[PDB]
Curated annotation (Swiss-Prot), chain A:
Protein's UniProt keywords contain Hydrolase: no
Biological source species: Escherichia coli (strain K12)
GO biological process: cytoplasmic translation; negative regulation of translation; translation
Keyword tags: Acetylation, Repressor, Ribonucleoprotein, Ribosomal protein, RNA-binding, rRNA-binding, Translation regulation
Residues of the full protein shown: 1 to 131 of 165
Name assigned to this protein: Large ribosomal subunit protein uL10
Similarity section: Belongs to the universal ribosomal protein uL10 family.
GO function terms (MF aspect): large ribosomal subunit rRNA binding; ribosome binding; structural constituent of ribosome
Purpose of the protein: Forms part of the ribosomal stalk, playing a central role in the interaction of the ribosome with GTP-bound translation factors. Protein L10 is also a translational repressor protein. It controls the translation of the rplJL-rpoBC operon by binding to its mRNA.
Source domain of life: Bacteria
Claim: Ribosomal protein is one of the keywords in the record: yes
Summary of subunit composition and partner proteins: Part of the ribosomal stalk of the 50S ribosomal subunit. The N-terminus interacts with L11 and the large rRNA to form the base of the stalk. The C-terminus forms an elongated spine to which 2 L12 dimers bind in a sequential fashion forming a pentameric L10(L12)(L12)2 complex. Two L12 dimers associate with a copy of L10 to form a very strong complex (called L8).
Swiss-Prot record, chain B:
Subunit note: Part of the 50S ribosomal subunit. Cross-links to the A and P site tRNAs. Interacts with assembly factor DarP(YjgA).
Keywords assigned by UniProt, alphabetized: Hydroxylation, Methylation, Ribonucleoprotein, Ribosomal protein, RNA-binding, rRNA-binding, tRNA-binding
Protein name in UniProt: Large ribosomal subunit protein uL16
Entries under InterPro entries matching the protein: Ribosomal_uL16, Ribosomal_uL16_bact-type, Ribosomal_uL16_CS, Ribosomal_uL16_dom, Ribosomal_uL16_sf
Any one of the GO BP annotations: cytoplasmic translation
GO cellular component: cytoplasm; cytosolic large ribosomal subunit
Molecular function terms, GO-annotated: rRNA binding; structural constituent of ribosome; tRNA binding
Keyword Ribonucleoprotein: yes
Family according to the record: Belongs to the universal ribosomal protein uL16 family.
Role according to the record: Binds directly to 23S ribosomal RNA and is located at the A site of the peptidyltransferase center. It contacts the A and P site tRNAs. One of the last ribosomal proteins to be assembled in the 50S subunit. The simultaneous presence of uL16 and bL36 probably triggers ObgE's GTPase activity and eventual dissociation from the mature 50S ribosmal subunit. It has an essential role in subunit assembly.
From Swiss-Prot, chain C:
Keywords: Ribonucleoprotein, Ribosomal protein, RNA-binding, rRNA-binding
Regions annotated as coiled coil: none
Function summary: This is one of the proteins that binds to the 5S RNA in the ribosome where it forms part of the central protuberance. Binds to the 5S rRNA independently of L5 and L18. Not required for binding of the 5S rRNA/L5/L18 subcomplex to 23S rRNA.
Protein name: Large ribosomal subunit protein bL25
Family statement: Belongs to the bacterial ribosomal protein bL25 family.
CDD domains: Ribosomal_L25_TL5_CTC
Biological process terms in GO annotation: cytoplasmic translation; negative regulation of translation; response to radiation; ribosomal large subunit assembly; translation
Native organism taxonomy: Bacteria, Pseudomonadati, Pseudomonadota, Gammaproteobacteria, Enterobacterales
Complex and partners: Part of the 50S ribosomal subunit; part of the 5S rRNA/L5/L18/L25 subcomplex. Contacts the 5S rRNA.
Gene source species: Escherichia coli (strain K12)
Pfam families: Ribosomal_L25p (PF01386)
Keyword match Cell inner membrane: no
GO CC aspect terms: cytoplasm; cytosol; cytosolic large ribosomal subunit
Curated annotation (Swiss-Prot), chain D:
HAMAP family: Ribosomal_bL36
Gene: rpmJ
Ribonucleoprotein recorded as keyword: yes
Keywords: Ribonucleoprotein, Ribosomal protein, RNA-binding, rRNA-binding
Family listed: Belongs to the bacterial ribosomal protein bL36 family.
Keyword Ribosomal protein attached: yes
Source taxonomy: Bacteria, Pseudomonadati, Pseudomonadota, Gammaproteobacteria, Enterobacterales
Subunit structure: Part of the 50S ribosomal subunit.
Protein name (database record): Large ribosomal subunit protein bL36A
Length: 131, 136, 94, 38, 176, 66
RNA sequence: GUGAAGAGGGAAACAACCCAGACCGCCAGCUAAGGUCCCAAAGUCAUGGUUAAGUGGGAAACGAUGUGGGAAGGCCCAGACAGCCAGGAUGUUGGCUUAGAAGCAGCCAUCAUUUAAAGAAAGCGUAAUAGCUCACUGGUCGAGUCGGCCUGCGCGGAAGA
RNA sequence: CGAUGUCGGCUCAUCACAUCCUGGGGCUGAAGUAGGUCCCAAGGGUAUGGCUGUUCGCCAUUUAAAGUGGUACGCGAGCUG
């Protein structure tokens, strides 16, 4: 960081999304390249853009403190880095579809697209949604 | 070399060098080199340190030289016996008391000044110390 | 914020000043107004780190001297010539 | 190697050690940066 | 200090007894016996090796971390065993094993003969290689270093008995 | 710095030697007052190439064959 | 001031250095400088710190993760220092001399995207490349850690018959 | 200064290490040979002559090299003059 208040700024940046959280999308890609992360972001770049917040400050004392205001379900997974791909209009969106693209391209790891906040399921497929 | 133009007396005493310095204050520049030691400065040494400092800044900043030698210590032609008067004047030296600011410089950053003053530090015959210009 | 818990001096002079300056505490004196000049003792170590803050000069000091608290201003700074330490600072009673 | 009276950190990998009472400068990158006492 | 504040739990079965101030590890790859400096107080107690910073001996804390890594690598050696692999780099070089002695040729006139210490066993998967197995990390490290010391790799092409993991620098002539 | 007319001729290229003199002046001249200089100067060291070439070319006394 | 014209004790030996002014005798006692492990008279004295070099018990400019004590500061369980597990990119040959000189000969300048981050660039190696990358950026373990300042004592510096 | 005989050579040495050679190594603008510099090492070894009164030196020819100095710039109650 540059300041602890900047670390607190990263904390409040996370709560702006948690106040608008509708679902939960996880990606535990520990081994990735800049263009690897960019190939996923161009898919996000032409669907929405930067709107799909990818604020990765997933420490047990960082992300866990920035979630309990609303949708406390992701606090149980908390740490062990999660590349969050969530947007404001994410309620039943094409976010689950963006991870199957990564499992076939360059990434053998993407947390196997689990989904925790209200998909009414787990690791298994999510295709039947008003998307 | 720094020599007094039209001196009144050609040769003076070797005297003594004691007491704490006079020029403790730094006002012209912002960063200056101070002499924590006590010794003597030859003419060639001050001209060597002027050239070894004008190299690093490459025509930036403003360099000041606080002291002027103004005292000709002498040497005699070797193999001569003692007596017959004092020798011929060879070079000019300034006596330095502890706490005397030698150089002053501004128009340079704080980081570059600390490094360039190390160049002249090894060119002078006594102990060095780096300080900065403070109000009061 | 510039408050210094200070003590007064029982002795003074050339050697007496060096006697306590070696005990890591330098002398100072406050003059001004119409009252009596007060030779005050104060620890050395704290001030060198306090004068590092540039606002130390321009702002009004608020040190205390045995009960009565007097607001002061710094007048003179007598630094030791070659060694990086202080010896004597003058206080304008302001 | 080069003996001196001043062991200095020349490269970015030149490590400093006080091996056997003698201060030396070992270097895992440049082999001509080996220095001895000083 | 840091590593001294990290206990060493031995995988059960590989017995360890404390006979005074000498640590005896009985396992699958033999028996290891090594002394200790009088500044560290040891204790097995459960299966966790704890080292103590005794008073008086002012180098005691530094002695702790030292003894820690030693015994850590010691107990690991009796279980699996340490391995080193050196490539016989060089055109026209020969290296072979004949019993407990090593008969190799570094391009010298006379064949260099090296002797295996105690339990160090040698074998060659190929003519241009050697692989050494053993118990201690010191004896496995000494022979690997001594064979490297018979002929170090060149700075021009790299001919010599070197470590397969160690990369050598590559120089080149001044103008030719 | 043993300065000539054109080249400054730097010190280090001269090995000053002291040899016992040759004179009819007793104890001073025969042993102690060595004071005689056989200056060791060679051409190979930093003389401006033509000075080197115009030193070996025109043979002269006081210079060696080498 | 001493010696000269003052011996005596100490500085191993040493007119002038430190102590001290021999009238004589004594197998008597108290101190001075300086000393109290043995030679050699008296402390293997007490207490509390300090050095690892036989420093002490010959000496400097300068060099240094030696080490003791003291103060402030930077960062630090909204988890750092160091490793490890990943990246280090988006235009680019950087425009210019584009004669071959691709962030990697060199003038000089240097913005903005993907963002937790990445200098139109820290280095080796390259006619020119690649690779590995150092910066700077995420998870793992998760306790303090980092850089200077003032001083105490030491190391190297330190080669003669 | 009521004496401490003077260079060089000869004979005979002996010590220091700031090493000329042999020995052991680091590094290179070290491919190989051959060289450069630095570090450890004083055990041993360490030219014949022409010219000069010489030391010194130049030259001729050698050698692994033909080291540098201390010793009243060793050595005249040992020689030479």
């Amino acid at each position: 960081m540059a300041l602890n208040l900047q670390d607190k700024q990263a904390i409040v940046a996370e709560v702006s999304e948690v106040a608008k959280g509708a679902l939960s999308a996880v990606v535990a890609d520990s081994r990735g390249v800049t263009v690897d992360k960019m190939t996923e972001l161009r898919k996000a770049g032409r669907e929405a853009g930067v709107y799909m917040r990818v604020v990765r400050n997933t420490l047990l004392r960082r992300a866990v403190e920035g979630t309990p205001f609303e949708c406390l379900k992701d606090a149980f997974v908390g740490p062990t880095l999660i590349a969050y791909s969530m947007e404001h209009p994410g309620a039943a969106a094409r976010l689950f579809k963006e991870f199957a693209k990564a499992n076939a391209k360059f990434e053998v790891k993407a947390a196997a697209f689990e989904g925790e906040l209200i998909p009414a399921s787990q690791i298994d497929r999510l295709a039947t949604l008003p998307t | 070399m720094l020599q007094p133009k039209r001196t009144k007396f050609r040769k003076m005493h070797k005297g003594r060098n004691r007491g704490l310095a006079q020029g403790t204050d730094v006002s012209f520049g912002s960063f200056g080199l101070k002499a924590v030691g006590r010794g003597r400065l030859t003419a060639r040494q001050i001209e060597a340190a002027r050239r070894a400092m004008t190299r690093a800044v490459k025509r930036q900043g403003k360099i000041w030289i606080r002291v002027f030698p103004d005292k000709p210590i002498t040497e005699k032609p070797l193999a001569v016996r003692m007596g017959k008067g004092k020798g011929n004047v060879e070079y000019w030296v300034a006596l330095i008391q502890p706490g005397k600011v030698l150089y002053e410089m501004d128009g340079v950053p704080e980081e570059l000044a600390r490094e360039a003053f190390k160049l002249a530090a090894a060119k002078l015959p006594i102990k060095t110390t780096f300080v900065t210009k403070t109000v009061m | 914020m510039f408050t210094i818990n200070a003590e007064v001096r029982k002795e003074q002079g050339k050697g007496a000043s060096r006697r306590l300056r070696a005990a890591n505490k330098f002398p100072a004196i406050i003059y001004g107004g119409k009252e009596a000049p007060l030779a005050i003792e104060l620890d050395h170590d704290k001030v060198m780190n306090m004068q590092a803050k540039a606002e130390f000069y321009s702002e009004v000091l608020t040190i205390v001297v045995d009960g009565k608290e007097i607001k002061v201003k710094a007048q003179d700074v007598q630094r030791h010539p070659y060694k990086p330490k202080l010896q004597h600072i003058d206080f304008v009673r302001a | 190697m080069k003996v001196r009276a001043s062991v200095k950190k020349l490269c970015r990998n030149c490590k400093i050690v006080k091996r056997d009472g003698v201060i030396r400068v070992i270097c895992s990158a440049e082999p001509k940066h080996k220095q001895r006492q000083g | 200090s840091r590593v001294a504040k990290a206990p060493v739990v031995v995988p059960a079965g590989v017995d360890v007894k404390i006979n005074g101030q000498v640590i005896t590890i009985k396992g699958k790859n033999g028996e290891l016996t090594r002394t200790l400096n009088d500044a560290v107080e040891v204790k097995h107690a459960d299966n966790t090796l704890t080292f103590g910073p005794r008073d008086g001996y002012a180098d005691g804390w530094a002695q702790a971390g030292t003894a820690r890594a030693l015994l850590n690598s010691m107990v690991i050696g009796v279980t699996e065993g340490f391995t080193k692999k050196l490539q016989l780099v060089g055109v026209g070089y020969r290296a072979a094993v004949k019993g407990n002695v090593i008969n190799l040729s570094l391009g010298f006139s006379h064949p260099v003969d090296h002797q295996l210490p105690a339990g160090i066993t040698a074998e060659c998967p190929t003519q241009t290689e050697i692989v050494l197995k053993g118990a201690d990390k010191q004896v496995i490290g000494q022979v690997a270093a001594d064979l490297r010391a018979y002929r170090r790799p060149e700075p021009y092409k790299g001919k010599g008995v070197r470590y397969a993991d160690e990369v050598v620098r590559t120089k080149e002539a001044k103008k030719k | 710095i043993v300065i000539s007319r054109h080249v400054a001729i730097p010190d280090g290229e001269l090995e000053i030697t002291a040899i016992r003199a040759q004179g009819a002046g007793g104890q001073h001249v025969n042993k102690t007052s060595t004071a005689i200089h056989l200056r060791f100067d060679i051409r190979a060291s930093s003389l401006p190439e033509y000075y080197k070439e115009r030193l070996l070319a025109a043979s002269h006394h006081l210079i060696s064959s080498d």
